[PDB]
Write an enzyme that holds these catalytic residues in place. Structure first.
Site, PDB file in Angstrom:
ATOM      1  N   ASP A  25       0.817  -1.182   0.000  1.00 53.64           N
ATOM      2  CA  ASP A  25       0.000   0.000   0.000  1.00 53.64           C
ATOM      3  C   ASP A  25       0.860   1.243   0.000  1.00 53.64           C
ATOM      4  OD1 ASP A  25      -2.623   1.179   2.238  1.00 53.64           O
ATOM      5  OD2 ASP A  25      -1.788   2.011   0.401  1.00 53.64           O
ATOM      6  N   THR A  26       0.981   1.875  -1.169  1.00 52.89           N
ATOM      7  CA  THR A  26       1.793   3.079  -1.344  1.00 52.89           C
ATOM      8  C   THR A  26       1.139   4.266  -0.659  1.00 52.89           C
ATOM      9  OG1 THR A  26       0.777   3.459  -3.532  1.00 52.89           O
ATOM     10  CG2 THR A  26       2.893   2.354  -3.528  1.00 52.89           C
ATOM     11  N   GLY A  27      -0.178   4.244  -0.491  1.00 55.48           N
ATOM     12  CA  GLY A  27      -0.876   5.328   0.183  1.00 55.48           C
ATOM     13  C   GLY A  27      -0.827   5.272   1.698  1.00 55.48           C
TER      14      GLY A  27
HETATM   15  C1  AB1 Z   1      -9.989   0.683   0.270  1.00 50.53           C
HETATM   16  C2  AB1 Z   1     -10.636   1.800  -0.505  1.00 50.53           C
HETATM   17  C3  AB1 Z   1     -11.741   1.510  -1.308  1.00 50.53           C
HETATM   18  C4  AB1 Z   1     -12.377   2.516  -2.038  1.00 50.53           C
HETATM   19  C5  AB1 Z   1     -11.893   3.818  -1.960  1.00 50.53           C
HETATM   20  C6  AB1 Z   1     -10.788   4.116  -1.155  1.00 50.53           C
HETATM   21  C7  AB1 Z   1     -10.279   5.535  -1.082  1.00 50.53           C
HETATM   22  C8  AB1 Z   1     -10.160   3.107  -0.427  1.00 50.53           C
HETATM   23  O1  AB1 Z   1      -9.081   3.416   0.357  1.00 50.53           O
HETATM   24  C9  AB1 Z   1      -9.275   4.147   1.565  1.00 50.53           C
HETATM   25  C10 AB1 Z   1      -8.115   3.965   2.519  1.00 50.53           C
HETATM   26  O2  AB1 Z   1      -8.189   4.456   3.639  1.00 50.53           O
HETATM   27  N1  AB1 Z   1      -7.044   3.281   2.098  1.00 50.53           N
HETATM   28  C11 AB1 Z   1      -5.916   3.082   3.008  1.00 50.53           C
HETATM   29  C12 AB1 Z   1      -5.705   1.571   3.001  1.00 50.53           C
HETATM   30  C13 AB1 Z   1      -6.922   0.823   3.524  1.00 50.53           C
HETATM   31  C14 AB1 Z   1      -7.496  -0.186   2.744  1.00 50.53           C
HETATM   32  C15 AB1 Z   1      -8.610  -0.900   3.201  1.00 50.53           C
HETATM   33  C16 AB1 Z   1      -9.156  -0.604   4.443  1.00 50.53           C
HETATM   34  C17 AB1 Z   1      -8.577   0.396   5.228  1.00 50.53           C
HETATM   35  C18 AB1 Z   1      -7.469   1.113   4.778  1.00 50.53           C
HETATM   36  C19 AB1 Z   1      -4.704   3.865   2.490  1.00 50.53           C
HETATM   37  O3  AB1 Z   1      -4.349   3.366   1.215  1.00 50.53           O
HETATM   38  C20 AB1 Z   1      -4.927   5.382   2.381  1.00 50.53           C
HETATM   39  C21 AB1 Z   1      -4.957   6.184   3.695  1.00 50.53           C
HETATM   40  C22 AB1 Z   1      -4.784   7.675   3.367  1.00 50.53           C
HETATM   41  C23 AB1 Z   1      -4.705   8.599   4.579  1.00 50.53           C
HETATM   42  C24 AB1 Z   1      -5.820   8.844   5.379  1.00 50.53           C
HETATM   43  C25 AB1 Z   1      -5.710   9.694   6.477  1.00 50.53           C
HETATM   44  C26 AB1 Z   1      -4.506  10.322   6.793  1.00 50.53           C
HETATM   45  C27 AB1 Z   1      -3.390  10.093   5.994  1.00 50.53           C
HETATM   46  C28 AB1 Z   1      -3.497   9.237   4.892  1.00 50.53           C
HETATM   47  N2  AB1 Z   1      -3.779   5.817   4.485  1.00 50.53           N
HETATM   48  C29 AB1 Z   1      -3.865   5.397   5.758  1.00 50.53           C
HETATM   49  O4  AB1 Z   1      -4.917   5.295   6.386  1.00 50.53           O
HETATM   50  C30 AB1 Z   1      -2.551   5.081   6.426  1.00 50.53           C
HETATM   51  C31 AB1 Z   1      -2.623   3.794   7.268  1.00 50.53           C
HETATM   52  C32 AB1 Z   1      -3.142   2.597   6.478  1.00 50.53           C
HETATM   53  C33 AB1 Z   1      -1.278   3.417   7.883  1.00 50.53           C
HETATM   54  N3  AB1 Z   1      -2.176   6.264   7.218  1.00 50.53           N
HETATM   55  C34 AB1 Z   1      -3.013   6.536   8.393  1.00 50.53           C
HETATM   56  C35 AB1 Z   1      -2.171   7.349   9.397  1.00 50.53           C
HETATM   57  C36 AB1 Z   1      -1.553   8.603   8.769  1.00 50.53           C
HETATM   58  N4  AB1 Z   1      -0.891   8.118   7.563  1.00 50.53           N
HETATM   59  C37 AB1 Z   1      -1.174   7.036   6.827  1.00 50.53           C
HETATM   60  O5  AB1 Z   1      -0.524   6.751   5.835  1.00 50.53           O
END
Ligand code: AB1
EC number: 3.4.23.16
Lengths: 99, 99
Positions: A25-27
């Site tokens: 997960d790059t995000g």
């Molecule tokens: C899964 C999905 C389906 C449809 C649409 C979307 C946008 C989807 O993804 C939503 C999602 O939260 N995906 C996460 C992984 C995901 C997939 C499936 C279920 C739940 C999560 C991740 O990739 C992105 C999201 C971005 C983010 C949000 C808030 C603050 C900063 C960054 N990143 C994070 O939550 C990370 C965590 C995982 C360590 N994170 C949180 C602490 C601060 N920094 C940080 O990097």
């Protein structure tokens, strides 16, 4: 290996003598794993996703073997729906995006 | 371009005549964008990440330019803290993972 993104990029990790499937997960800044049996001392933390925040256990210097490659770093453990491999480990296995 | 993961993989997008920065997110199925001005008819929908669920407006067939490459697809607009380009658009610009 090169991974395309038509499917969820799920790989096989080995952590704490156990086999699990995790998402590259790059995000994600950090690695977050579902409730699992892990040894060591820890410090409580929060992780802020899309819907809010989750209370997780922070472990430092934990070994994970991601798709045959070895990394040592911070792993969070908490009520996450998916096992997430974040950039803190992805850099150690030399993972890059390409387009 | 090759993009390494030592920093958040942020690219410049152009959507609805406007310039934004978005995260290239292999861990996202869908593209979700911060509250912004988009034209068209929508459908209410519900995206759930870590920590819960957010109510979003779904638009189909939006044109986005990601780092110079054109893509057309579903864009969700909602109270996300970060602009996220998901796999539904990433596949279209030939975005791969490599390690
Ligand atoms: C899964 C999905 C389906 C449809 C649409 C979307 C946008 C989807 O993804 C939503 C999602 O939260 N995906 C996460 C992984 C995901 C997939 C499936 C279920 C739940 C999560 C991740 O990739 C992105 C999201 C971005 C983010 C949000 C808030 C603050 C900063 C960054 N990143 C994070 O939550 C990370 C965590 C995982 C360590 N994170 C949180 C602490 C601060 N920094 C940080 O990097």
């Amino acid at each position: 290996p090169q991974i395309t993104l038509w499917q969820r990029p799920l790989v096989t990790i080995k952590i704490g003598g156990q086999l699990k499937e995790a998402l590259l997960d790059t995000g994600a800044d950090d690695t977050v794993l579902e409730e699992m049996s892990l040894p060591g001392r820890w410090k409580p933390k929060m992780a802020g996703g899309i819907g809010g925040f989750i209370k997780v256990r922070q472990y430092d210097q934990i070994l994970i073997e991601i798709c045959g490659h070895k990394a040592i770093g911070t792993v969070l453990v908490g009520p996450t729906p998916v096992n997430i491999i974040g950039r803190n480990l992805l850099t150690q296995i030399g993972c890059t995006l390409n387009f």
